[PDB]
Amino acid sequence: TLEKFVDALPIPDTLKPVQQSKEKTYYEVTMEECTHQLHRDLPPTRLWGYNGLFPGPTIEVKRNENVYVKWMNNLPSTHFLPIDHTIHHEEPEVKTVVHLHGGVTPDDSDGYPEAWFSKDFEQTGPYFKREVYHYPNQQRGAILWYHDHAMALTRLNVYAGLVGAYIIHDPKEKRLKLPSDEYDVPLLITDRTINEDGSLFYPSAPENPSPSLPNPSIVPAFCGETILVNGKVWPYLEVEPRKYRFRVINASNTRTYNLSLDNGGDFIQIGSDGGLLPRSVKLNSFSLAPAERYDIIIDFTAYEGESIILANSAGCGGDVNPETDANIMQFRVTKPLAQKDESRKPKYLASYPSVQHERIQNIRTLKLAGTQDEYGRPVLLLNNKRWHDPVTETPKVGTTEIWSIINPTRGTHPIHLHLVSFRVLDRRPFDIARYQESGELSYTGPAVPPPPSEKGWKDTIQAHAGEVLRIAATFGPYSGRYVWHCHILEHTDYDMMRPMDITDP
Ligand SMILES: [Cu+2]
Ligand SMILES: [Cu+2]
Ligand SMILES: [Cu+2]
Ligand SMILES: [Cu+2]
């Protein structure tokens, strides 16, 4: 396999605006097919990238900054990855739309799956309204990320390389003196399978395919043979012996990571999807499912000279291989100090979410289920409803609801709600056989409150097998048409995604 830790970690340049004033920041980003070398020993790989880059440029904004991005499609008319024509029913083969994940965004700038557009906006989906997306950024400082969200194509377009980081900086956070500038580094983790000739491999069908299957066929999960960070296979990063802030983003299709440091050192978590935790948390390891973000500090002060591997213990379609997917990247604490480390790792970070006292307007019970199609394939469904079924999740603007998510399947699903961040209430185990036979919910143990990592604000949440997960969200500040879905992209596309109407009665 490819030799680990021979390429330096790329750090995506920060995108520069086309126009900027005090009142408005204007960006242009064009999707392009380009080639990039993913490892020292590989020929360049054909990829799809924002501004021709993989990952896309990092976008940095201030809280309340009035930002516009004209996202543009300059991609070929034919995909290079296998399209399954049977999963969705004149239309262009290549459709794109950019979703700012975690964005508190007006609905027509949220990147609705059916707001897609082809090259130069020649053809547009039925929910398309505008070329230039509007991000008011009226929300907590946090790690966001942007990715393609096109109907029935998300797993392919994201795998192609259409991902990037987007960081909101709240000037009120500056007083905490967290590691900043060159000591504040995004880590976008993507697993990939790469052919000998350097081309991306993505399966055309399940292994040993039933003759009943179409060709190509969607697969229910994808586990890549190799791990990349910031678009390089198993890279190294030379770090100074001091505190660093890392913005850890799981930008993988299916894979969940369980991260640790091979010397047994700790992370300090300072943030979740929705921003700073109320209190910092010392952690030896953490789970990171697709689309989750961890804002962490690693203190290299006592580790000068050392090589430390960011390791992974979570299997994907099997146990981890010590030689391959057990490795993420390697820190080498060999960079001389550019100046004194004046950064801090404060304990007191932000207001507790529990300080809020909203009235529970509604309690939604939601099940993670599905059916089988005419070809024998699993179709994953939220509430046994298809994406195209009439909307049922219709919270009122400005109100708070509890969502109780029932998972009787054999796997975890990272459930994501657009627009909002939410509080995690608890998880509770239940009798799966009883639920499947009778629809009756009989608990087999007490409710378990969230770990400290989940006591802040979240937007993507692991709903484990045989458990009921309760979350609480206030729906707003905007009304409109949004979505909620599992963020395993192979599930998202067939068909584990539903519309979410936030109404203004
Ligand atoms: Cu997303
Ligand atoms: Cu999202
Ligand atoms: Cu799922
Ligand atoms: Cu989404």
Short mmCIF file of C-alpha atoms and ligand atoms in Angstrom, two decimals:
data_model
loop_
_atom_site.label_atom_id
_atom_site.label_comp_id
_atom_site.label_asym_id
_atom_site.label_seq_id
_atom_site.Cartn_x
_atom_site.Cartn_y
_atom_site.Cartn_z
CA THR A 1 0.00 0.00 0.00
CA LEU A 2 1.02 3.71 -0.22
CA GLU A 3 3.89 4.72 2.08
CA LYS A 4 2.51 6.62 5.08
CA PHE A 5 3.66 10.12 6.05
CA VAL A 6 5.79 11.21 3.05
CA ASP A 7 3.79 14.27 1.96
CA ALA A 8 3.43 17.51 3.94
CA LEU A 9 -0.14 18.41 4.95
CA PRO A 10 -1.59 21.06 2.61
CA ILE A 11 -3.27 24.00 4.31
CA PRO A 12 -5.87 25.41 1.90
CA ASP A 13 -5.31 29.10 1.20
CA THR A 14 -7.99 31.42 2.53
CA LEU A 15 -10.29 32.63 -0.26
CA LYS A 16 -9.96 36.31 -1.19
CA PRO A 17 -13.13 38.28 -2.05
CA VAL A 18 -13.77 39.60 -5.57
CA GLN A 19 -15.27 42.73 -3.99
CA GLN A 20 -15.41 43.85 -0.37
CA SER A 21 -16.71 46.88 1.49
CA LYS A 22 -17.88 47.48 5.05
CA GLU A 23 -21.44 46.62 3.89
CA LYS A 24 -20.86 43.58 1.66
CA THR A 25 -18.32 40.83 0.97
CA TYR A 26 -18.60 39.20 -2.45
CA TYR A 27 -16.96 35.89 -3.43
CA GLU A 28 -16.87 33.88 -6.64
CA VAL A 29 -16.22 30.15 -6.58
CA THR A 30 -16.18 28.04 -9.74
CA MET A 31 -16.40 24.23 -9.79
CA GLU A 32 -13.72 22.87 -12.14
CA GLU A 33 -12.36 19.49 -13.17
CA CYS A 34 -8.60 19.60 -12.45
CA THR A 35 -5.81 17.17 -11.56
CA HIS A 36 -3.89 16.99 -8.29
CA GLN A 37 -1.30 14.64 -6.86
CA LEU A 38 -2.73 12.96 -3.75
CA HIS A 39 0.49 11.14 -2.77
CA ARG A 40 4.21 11.29 -3.66
CA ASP A 41 4.03 7.91 -5.43
CA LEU A 42 0.85 8.43 -7.50
CA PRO A 43 0.20 10.01 -10.91
CA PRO A 44 -2.09 13.08 -10.65
CA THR A 45 -5.75 12.35 -9.91
CA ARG A 46 -8.64 13.81 -11.90
CA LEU A 47 -10.93 15.55 -9.40
CA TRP A 48 -13.73 18.09 -9.16
CA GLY A 49 -12.79 21.07 -7.02
CA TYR A 50 -14.09 24.46 -5.92
CA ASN A 51 -11.83 26.90 -7.77
CA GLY A 52 -10.14 23.76 -9.08
CA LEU A 53 -8.81 22.92 -5.60
CA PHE A 54 -9.17 19.86 -3.36
CA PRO A 55 -10.24 20.71 -0.69
CA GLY A 56 -11.79 23.97 -1.81
CA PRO A 57 -10.39 27.25 -0.48
CA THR A 58 -11.00 27.93 3.21
CA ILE A 59 -13.48 30.76 3.61
CA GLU A 60 -13.10 32.99 6.67
CA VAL A 61 -15.84 35.35 7.83
CA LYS A 62 -16.77 37.42 10.86
CA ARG A 63 -19.98 36.90 12.77
CA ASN A 64 -22.65 39.15 11.13
CA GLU A 65 -20.45 39.70 8.06
CA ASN A 66 -22.75 40.27 5.07
CA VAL A 67 -21.36 37.60 2.74
CA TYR A 68 -22.33 36.57 -0.80
CA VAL A 69 -20.89 33.70 -2.78
CA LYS A 70 -21.63 33.18 -6.45
CA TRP A 71 -21.16 29.41 -6.72
CA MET A 72 -20.64 28.49 -10.38
CA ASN A 73 -20.59 25.25 -12.33
CA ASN A 74 -17.86 24.96 -14.96
CA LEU A 75 -17.77 21.17 -14.90
CA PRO A 76 -17.89 18.67 -17.80
CA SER A 77 -21.31 17.51 -19.05
CA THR A 78 -20.51 13.93 -18.14
CA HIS A 79 -19.62 12.53 -14.74
CA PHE A 80 -16.44 10.52 -14.26
CA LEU A 81 -18.00 8.51 -11.39
CA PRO A 82 -20.74 5.89 -11.92
CA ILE A 83 -24.28 7.31 -12.03
CA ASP A 84 -27.21 5.12 -10.97
CA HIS A 85 -30.13 6.18 -13.16
CA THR A 86 -32.72 4.14 -11.23
CA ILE A 87 -32.72 6.01 -7.89
CA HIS A 88 -34.47 9.18 -9.10
CA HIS A 89 -37.05 9.71 -11.85
CA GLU A 90 -34.48 16.41 -20.46
CA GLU A 91 -32.41 16.74 -17.23
CA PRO A 92 -28.61 17.20 -17.27
CA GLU A 93 -26.51 14.29 -15.99
CA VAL A 94 -24.24 16.62 -13.98
CA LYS A 95 -26.17 18.76 -11.46
CA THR A 96 -24.58 20.84 -8.70
CA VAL A 97 -25.67 22.96 -5.74
CA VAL A 98 -23.58 24.19 -2.80
CA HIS A 99 -24.77 23.75 0.78
CA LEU A 100 -23.08 25.67 3.60
CA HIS A 101 -23.32 23.02 6.33
CA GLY A 102 -24.21 24.67 9.66
CA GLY A 103 -25.12 27.91 7.89
CA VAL A 104 -27.92 29.99 9.40
CA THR A 105 -29.03 30.72 5.88
CA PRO A 106 -32.18 31.94 4.06
CA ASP A 107 -33.79 28.95 2.38
CA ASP A 108 -32.98 29.86 -1.24
CA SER A 109 -29.29 30.16 -0.33
CA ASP A 110 -29.21 26.92 1.72
CA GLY A 111 -28.50 24.68 -1.30
CA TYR A 112 -31.76 22.73 -1.50
CA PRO A 113 -31.19 19.39 -3.31
CA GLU A 114 -33.63 20.44 -6.06
CA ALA A 115 -32.15 23.95 -6.38
CA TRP A 116 -29.41 22.41 -8.55
CA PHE A 117 -27.90 23.95 -11.67
CA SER A 118 -25.88 22.68 -14.62
CA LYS A 119 -22.88 24.41 -16.27
CA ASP A 120 -23.31 28.23 -16.46
CA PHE A 121 -26.82 27.80 -14.92
CA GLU A 122 -28.07 26.62 -18.33
CA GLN A 123 -30.55 24.25 -16.69
CA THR A 124 -31.84 24.66 -13.14
CA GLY A 125 -33.87 22.50 -10.76
CA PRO A 126 -37.51 23.23 -9.81
CA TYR A 127 -36.52 24.96 -6.53
CA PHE A 128 -33.69 27.11 -7.94
CA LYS A 129 -34.13 30.83 -7.22
CA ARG A 130 -30.76 32.59 -7.33
CA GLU A 131 -27.16 32.47 -8.60
CA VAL A 132 -25.51 34.40 -5.78
CA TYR A 133 -26.01 32.82 -2.36
CA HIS A 134 -26.43 35.04 0.74
CA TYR A 135 -24.79 34.16 4.06
CA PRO A 136 -25.70 36.73 6.76
CA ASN A 137 -23.63 34.75 9.33
CA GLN A 138 -25.86 35.84 12.20
CA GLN A 139 -24.84 32.95 14.37
CA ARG A 140 -22.21 31.71 16.85
CA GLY A 141 -18.59 31.48 15.74
CA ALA A 142 -18.04 27.88 14.66
CA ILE A 143 -16.55 25.41 12.17
CA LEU A 144 -18.79 25.12 9.15
CA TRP A 145 -18.06 23.44 5.83
CA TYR A 146 -19.47 23.61 2.34
CA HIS A 147 -20.22 20.73 0.01
CA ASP A 148 -22.31 19.72 -2.98
CA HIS A 149 -25.94 18.83 -2.15
CA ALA A 150 -27.44 17.95 -5.59
CA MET A 151 -30.45 15.60 -5.68
CA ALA A 152 -29.41 11.91 -6.06
CA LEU A 153 -25.77 12.94 -6.73
CA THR A 154 -24.39 14.07 -3.34
CA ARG A 155 -22.40 10.86 -2.68
CA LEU A 156 -20.72 11.21 -6.09
CA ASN A 157 -20.16 14.97 -6.20
CA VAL A 158 -18.71 15.08 -2.67
CA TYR A 159 -16.53 12.01 -3.34
CA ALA A 160 -15.33 13.77 -6.53
CA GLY A 161 -13.80 16.42 -4.23
CA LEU A 162 -16.44 19.12 -3.79
CA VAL A 163 -15.78 20.01 -0.13
CA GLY A 164 -14.21 22.97 1.73
CA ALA A 165 -13.97 24.63 5.16
CA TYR A 166 -15.84 27.77 6.20
CA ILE A 167 -14.95 29.36 9.52
CA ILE A 168 -17.01 31.97 11.35
CA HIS A 169 -14.97 34.19 13.68
CA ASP A 170 -16.83 35.95 16.49
CA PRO A 171 -14.65 38.90 17.65
CA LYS A 172 -16.00 38.32 21.18
CA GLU A 173 -14.00 35.02 21.23
CA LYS A 174 -10.69 36.87 20.74
CA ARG A 175 -10.39 37.58 24.49
CA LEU A 176 -10.06 33.82 25.17
CA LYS A 177 -6.65 33.93 23.39
CA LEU A 178 -7.12 30.50 21.77
CA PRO A 179 -4.38 29.42 19.32
CA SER A 180 -4.79 31.57 16.20
CA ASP A 181 -3.46 32.32 12.70
CA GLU A 182 -0.87 29.70 11.66
CA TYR A 183 -1.61 27.78 14.90
CA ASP A 184 -5.27 27.37 13.93
CA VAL A 185 -5.49 24.69 11.21
CA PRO A 186 -8.43 22.92 9.54
CA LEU A 187 -8.19 19.15 9.16
CA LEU A 188 -10.62 17.89 6.52
CA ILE A 189 -10.60 14.10 6.64
CA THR A 190 -11.73 12.14 3.58
CA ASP A 191 -11.29 8.45 2.91
CA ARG A 192 -10.71 7.41 -0.70
CA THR A 193 -9.87 4.35 -2.76
CA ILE A 194 -7.35 5.20 -5.47
CA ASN A 195 -6.41 3.08 -8.51
CA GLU A 196 -2.79 2.34 -9.55
CA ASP A 197 -3.06 4.90 -12.38
CA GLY A 198 -4.02 7.54 -9.79
CA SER A 199 -7.73 7.67 -10.72
CA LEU A 200 -10.40 7.68 -8.00
CA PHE A 201 -12.20 4.39 -7.51
CA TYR A 202 -15.87 4.46 -6.58
CA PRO A 203 -17.92 1.24 -6.85
CA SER A 204 -20.21 0.68 -9.85
CA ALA A 205 -22.15 -1.92 -7.86
CA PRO A 206 -22.07 -3.98 -4.63
CA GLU A 207 -19.42 -6.72 -4.51
CA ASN A 208 -20.63 -9.96 -6.13
CA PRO A 209 -23.71 -8.20 -7.56
CA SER A 210 -27.05 -9.98 -7.91
CA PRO A 211 -28.07 -10.19 -11.61
CA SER A 212 -31.31 -8.43 -10.53
CA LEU A 213 -29.25 -5.23 -10.00
CA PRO A 214 -29.01 -2.33 -12.44
CA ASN A 215 -25.58 -1.21 -13.67
CA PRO A 216 -24.36 1.07 -12.26
CA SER A 217 -26.04 0.53 -8.89
CA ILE A 218 -25.91 2.66 -5.74
CA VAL A 219 -24.21 0.93 -2.79
CA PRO A 220 -25.49 1.29 0.81
CA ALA A 221 -22.08 2.28 2.25
CA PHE A 222 -18.58 3.11 1.04
CA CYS A 223 -15.31 2.51 2.92
CA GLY A 224 -12.17 3.95 1.32
CA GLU A 225 -8.87 2.05 1.47
CA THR A 226 -6.82 5.20 2.12
CA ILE A 227 -7.21 8.21 4.45
CA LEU A 228 -6.50 11.75 3.30
CA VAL A 229 -6.29 14.98 5.26
CA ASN A 230 -6.56 18.24 3.33
CA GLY A 231 -6.31 16.33 0.04
CA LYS A 232 -3.12 14.33 0.76
CA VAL A 233 -2.84 10.64 1.60
CA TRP A 234 -1.56 9.98 5.17
CA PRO A 235 0.33 13.29 5.42
CA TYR A 236 2.67 14.69 8.07
CA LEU A 237 2.51 18.14 9.61
CA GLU A 238 5.54 19.81 11.15
CA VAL A 239 4.36 21.59 14.29
CA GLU A 240 6.04 23.91 16.84
CA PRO A 241 6.31 22.64 20.44
CA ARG A 242 3.28 24.63 21.63
CA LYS A 243 -0.54 24.79 21.56
CA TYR A 244 -2.41 24.37 18.25
CA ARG A 245 -6.11 24.69 17.48
CA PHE A 246 -7.43 22.17 14.93
CA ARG A 247 -10.79 22.39 13.14
CA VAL A 248 -11.50 18.71 12.57
CA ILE A 249 -14.08 18.03 9.85
CA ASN A 250 -15.23 14.57 8.78
CA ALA A 251 -15.83 15.12 5.07
CA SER A 252 -16.14 11.39 4.32
CA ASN A 253 -19.15 9.75 2.62
CA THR A 254 -19.79 6.95 5.14
CA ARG A 255 -16.77 6.45 7.42
CA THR A 256 -16.80 7.23 11.13
CA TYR A 257 -13.42 7.80 12.83
CA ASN A 258 -12.49 7.20 16.44
CA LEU A 259 -9.49 9.44 16.93
CA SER A 260 -6.63 9.30 19.42
CA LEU A 261 -2.91 10.09 19.67
CA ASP A 262 -0.55 7.12 19.55
CA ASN A 263 1.57 8.43 22.45
CA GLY A 264 -1.59 8.44 24.60
CA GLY A 265 -1.70 12.25 24.85
CA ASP A 266 -4.98 14.15 25.29
CA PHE A 267 -7.03 16.46 23.10
CA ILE A 268 -8.80 19.42 24.66
CA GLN A 269 -12.17 19.88 22.96
CA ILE A 270 -13.27 23.50 22.91
CA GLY A 271 -16.08 23.28 20.31
CA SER A 272 -18.73 21.15 18.62
CA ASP A 273 -20.73 21.68 15.33
CA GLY A 274 -22.63 24.67 16.74
CA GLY A 275 -19.67 26.47 18.30
CA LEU A 276 -17.78 26.66 21.60
CA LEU A 277 -18.75 24.24 24.33
CA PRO A 278 -19.63 25.88 27.67
CA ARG A 279 -16.54 24.22 29.27
CA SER A 280 -13.40 22.74 27.66
CA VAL A 281 -13.20 18.92 27.85
CA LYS A 282 -10.04 16.79 28.18
CA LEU A 283 -10.41 13.72 25.99
CA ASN A 284 -8.21 10.70 25.23
CA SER A 285 -10.31 9.87 22.14
CA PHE A 286 -13.43 10.95 20.23
CA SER A 287 -15.89 9.56 17.70
CA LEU A 288 -16.38 11.62 14.56
CA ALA A 289 -19.17 10.57 12.18
CA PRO A 290 -19.66 12.08 8.71
CA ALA A 291 -20.29 15.86 8.88
CA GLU A 292 -19.46 16.22 12.61
CA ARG A 293 -16.87 18.81 13.58
CA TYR A 294 -14.54 18.91 16.58
CA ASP A 295 -12.83 22.13 17.56
CA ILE A 296 -9.81 20.93 19.57
CA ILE A 297 -6.50 22.06 21.09
CA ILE A 298 -3.45 19.77 21.03
CA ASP A 299 -0.57 20.87 23.26
CA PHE A 300 2.77 19.81 21.75
CA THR A 301 4.80 21.78 24.34
CA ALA A 302 6.15 18.68 26.15
CA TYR A 303 6.65 16.68 22.95
CA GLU A 304 9.45 18.45 21.07
CA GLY A 305 11.25 16.24 18.53
CA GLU A 306 8.53 13.59 18.63
CA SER A 307 6.47 12.02 15.87
CA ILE A 308 2.88 11.50 17.02
CA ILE A 309 0.33 9.62 14.90
CA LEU A 310 -3.31 10.72 14.84
CA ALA A 311 -4.75 7.20 15.02
CA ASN A 312 -8.15 5.68 14.27
CA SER A 313 -9.74 2.65 15.99
CA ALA A 314 -13.13 2.60 14.22
CA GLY A 315 -13.61 -0.06 11.56
CA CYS A 316 -15.40 0.49 8.27
CA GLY A 317 -16.83 -2.75 6.87
CA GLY A 318 -14.50 -4.60 9.25
CA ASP A 319 -11.80 -4.02 11.89
CA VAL A 320 -9.16 -1.32 11.30
CA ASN A 321 -5.98 -2.29 9.52
CA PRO A 322 -2.92 -1.10 11.58
CA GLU A 323 -1.04 -0.51 8.33
CA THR A 324 -3.72 1.54 6.58
CA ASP A 325 -6.97 3.04 7.95
CA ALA A 326 -5.76 2.97 11.58
CA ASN A 327 -3.62 5.94 10.52
CA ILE A 328 -4.88 9.46 9.80
CA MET A 329 -1.80 11.70 9.88
CA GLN A 330 1.49 12.27 11.70
CA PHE A 331 2.56 15.30 13.68
CA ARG A 332 6.30 15.99 13.81
CA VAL A 333 7.13 18.41 16.62
CA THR A 334 10.22 19.75 14.85
CA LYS A 335 9.31 23.32 13.78
CA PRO A 336 11.29 25.95 15.71
CA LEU A 337 9.14 28.38 17.75
CA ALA A 338 8.41 31.53 15.71
CA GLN A 339 7.54 33.38 18.94
CA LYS A 340 6.41 32.72 22.52
CA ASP A 341 3.23 30.65 22.83
CA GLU A 342 0.81 33.27 24.16
CA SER A 343 -2.25 31.14 23.48
CA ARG A 344 -4.44 29.77 26.25
CA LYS A 345 -6.53 26.67 26.88
CA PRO A 346 -9.24 28.28 29.06
CA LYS A 347 -11.78 26.22 31.00
CA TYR A 348 -14.62 28.77 30.81
CA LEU A 349 -15.64 29.15 27.18
CA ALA A 350 -19.31 30.00 26.62
CA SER A 351 -22.79 30.24 28.10
CA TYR A 352 -24.48 26.90 28.77
CA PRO A 353 -27.31 25.96 26.36
CA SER A 354 -29.31 24.95 29.49
CA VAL A 355 -29.50 28.67 30.47
CA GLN A 356 -32.29 28.95 27.86
CA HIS A 357 -35.83 28.07 28.99
CA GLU A 358 -37.98 27.68 25.87
CA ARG A 359 -41.45 26.13 25.98
CA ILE A 360 -41.78 22.75 24.26
CA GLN A 361 -44.24 23.47 21.44
CA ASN A 362 -44.14 19.95 19.99
CA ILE A 363 -42.67 16.48 20.39
CA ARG A 364 -41.93 14.65 17.13
CA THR A 365 -41.40 10.92 17.10
CA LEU A 366 -39.30 9.86 14.12
CA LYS A 367 -38.15 6.41 13.06
CA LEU A 368 -35.15 5.33 11.00
CA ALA A 369 -36.56 2.65 8.71
CA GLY A 370 -36.96 1.71 5.05
CA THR A 371 -38.02 -0.87 2.51
CA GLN A 372 -36.72 -2.95 -0.38
CA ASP A 373 -36.94 -1.93 -4.05
CA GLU A 374 -37.80 -4.02 -7.15
CA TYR A 375 -34.10 -4.90 -7.51
CA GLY A 376 -33.70 -6.24 -3.95
CA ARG A 377 -31.77 -3.18 -2.71
CA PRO A 378 -32.38 -1.49 0.65
CA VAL A 379 -34.05 1.93 0.43
CA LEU A 380 -33.33 3.82 3.64
CA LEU A 381 -36.25 5.98 4.79
CA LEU A 382 -37.04 8.54 7.47
CA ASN A 383 -40.53 7.59 8.82
CA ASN A 384 -41.02 5.23 5.85
CA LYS A 385 -41.56 8.33 3.71
CA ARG A 386 -39.75 9.00 0.45
CA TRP A 387 -38.07 12.35 -0.21
CA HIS A 388 -40.88 13.21 -2.66
CA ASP A 389 -43.75 12.41 -0.27
CA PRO A 390 -45.64 15.48 1.04
CA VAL A 391 -43.78 17.30 3.85
CA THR A 392 -44.56 16.16 7.41
CA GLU A 393 -41.87 17.88 9.50
CA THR A 394 -43.39 21.34 9.73
CA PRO A 395 -42.14 23.21 12.83
CA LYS A 396 -43.34 26.78 13.40
CA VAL A 397 -40.76 29.55 13.24
CA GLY A 398 -39.45 30.66 16.64
CA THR A 399 -40.79 27.60 18.47
CA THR A 400 -38.91 24.80 20.22
CA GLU A 401 -39.52 21.09 19.66
CA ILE A 402 -38.23 17.81 21.03
CA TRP A 403 -37.40 15.28 18.33
CA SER A 404 -37.30 11.66 19.50
CA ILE A 405 -35.37 9.63 16.96
CA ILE A 406 -36.02 5.88 17.06
CA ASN A 407 -33.25 3.72 15.57
CA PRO A 408 -34.27 0.05 15.20
CA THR A 409 -31.64 -0.59 12.47
CA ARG A 410 -28.31 -2.37 13.05
CA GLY A 411 -26.16 0.75 12.46
CA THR A 412 -25.57 4.32 13.62
CA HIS A 413 -26.95 7.15 11.49
CA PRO A 414 -25.55 10.66 11.83
CA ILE A 415 -28.76 12.71 11.68
CA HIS A 416 -28.45 16.27 10.45
CA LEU A 417 -30.93 19.17 10.51
CA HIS A 418 -30.37 22.15 8.24
CA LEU A 419 -30.60 25.75 9.56
CA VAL A 420 -30.53 25.02 13.28
CA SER A 421 -28.18 23.76 15.94
CA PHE A 422 -29.70 21.70 18.74
CA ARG A 423 -29.22 20.40 22.27
CA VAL A 424 -28.80 16.71 22.95
CA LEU A 425 -31.18 15.57 25.71
CA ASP A 426 -30.50 11.83 26.16
CA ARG A 427 -30.20 8.36 24.64
CA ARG A 428 -32.17 5.29 25.75
CA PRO A 429 -31.92 1.60 24.75
CA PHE A 430 -35.06 -0.27 23.63
CA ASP A 431 -36.32 -3.72 22.64
CA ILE A 432 -35.75 -3.88 18.87
CA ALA A 433 -37.69 -7.12 18.17
CA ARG A 434 -40.68 -5.84 20.16
CA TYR A 435 -40.64 -2.53 18.24
CA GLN A 436 -40.42 -4.28 14.86
CA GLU A 437 -43.20 -6.75 15.71
CA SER A 438 -45.64 -4.35 17.39
CA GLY A 439 -44.44 -0.76 16.87
CA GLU A 440 -44.46 -0.62 20.67
CA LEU A 441 -41.53 1.06 22.40
CA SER A 442 -40.32 -0.81 25.48
CA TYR A 443 -37.15 0.56 27.08
CA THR A 444 -34.49 -1.89 28.28
CA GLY A 445 -32.57 0.62 30.43
CA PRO A 446 -32.66 4.18 31.81
CA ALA A 447 -32.03 7.31 29.74
CA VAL A 448 -28.38 8.36 29.45
CA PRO A 449 -27.54 12.09 29.33
CA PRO A 450 -25.04 13.28 26.68
CA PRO A 451 -21.26 13.12 27.32
CA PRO A 452 -19.59 16.52 27.94
CA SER A 453 -18.66 16.70 24.22
CA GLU A 454 -22.40 16.80 23.50
CA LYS A 455 -23.45 19.36 26.14
CA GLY A 456 -23.05 22.26 23.70
CA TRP A 457 -24.65 22.89 20.30
CA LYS A 458 -24.81 20.18 17.64
CA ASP A 459 -26.21 19.93 14.10
CA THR A 460 -25.18 16.38 13.21
CA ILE A 461 -25.79 13.69 15.80
CA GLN A 462 -25.00 10.00 16.04
CA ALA A 463 -28.21 8.04 16.51
CA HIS A 464 -26.94 4.62 17.62
CA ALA A 465 -28.63 1.27 16.92
CA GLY A 466 -31.37 0.11 19.31
CA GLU A 467 -31.71 3.51 20.96
CA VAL A 468 -34.05 6.47 21.12
CA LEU A 469 -32.19 9.76 20.82
CA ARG A 470 -33.83 12.96 22.02
CA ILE A 471 -32.78 16.40 20.82
CA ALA A 472 -34.29 19.85 21.34
CA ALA A 473 -34.24 22.58 18.66
CA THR A 474 -35.59 26.10 18.30
CA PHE A 475 -36.62 26.55 14.68
CA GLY A 476 -35.49 29.86 13.23
CA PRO A 477 -34.64 32.62 12.73
CA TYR A 478 -35.81 32.08 9.13
CA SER A 479 -38.92 30.38 7.81
CA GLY A 480 -38.80 28.41 4.58
CA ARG A 481 -38.08 25.09 2.94
CA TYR A 482 -35.11 23.17 4.40
CA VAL A 483 -34.18 19.51 4.84
CA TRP A 484 -33.19 16.93 7.44
CA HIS A 485 -31.32 13.72 6.63
CA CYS A 486 -28.81 11.06 7.51
CA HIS A 487 -25.34 12.36 6.54
CA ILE A 488 -24.07 8.98 5.32
CA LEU A 489 -24.24 10.08 1.69
CA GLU A 490 -24.99 6.61 0.32
CA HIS A 491 -28.08 6.74 2.61
CA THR A 492 -28.89 10.39 1.83
CA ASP A 493 -29.25 9.66 -1.89
CA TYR A 494 -31.54 6.59 -1.49
CA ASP A 495 -33.57 7.88 0.16
CA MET A 496 -32.89 8.96 3.75
CA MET A 497 -33.70 12.64 3.37
CA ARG A 498 -36.91 14.58 3.98
CA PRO A 499 -38.05 18.18 3.44
CA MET A 500 -38.40 20.32 6.57
CA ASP A 501 -40.78 23.29 6.35
CA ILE A 502 -40.34 26.00 8.96
CA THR A 503 -43.67 27.83 8.80
CA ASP A 504 -44.67 31.42 9.55
CA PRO A 505 -48.38 31.18 10.52
CU CU B 1 -23.79 18.55 5.11
CU CU B 2 -26.35 20.76 6.31
CU CU B 3 -27.95 6.48 7.46
CU CU B 4 -27.75 18.48 4.11
#
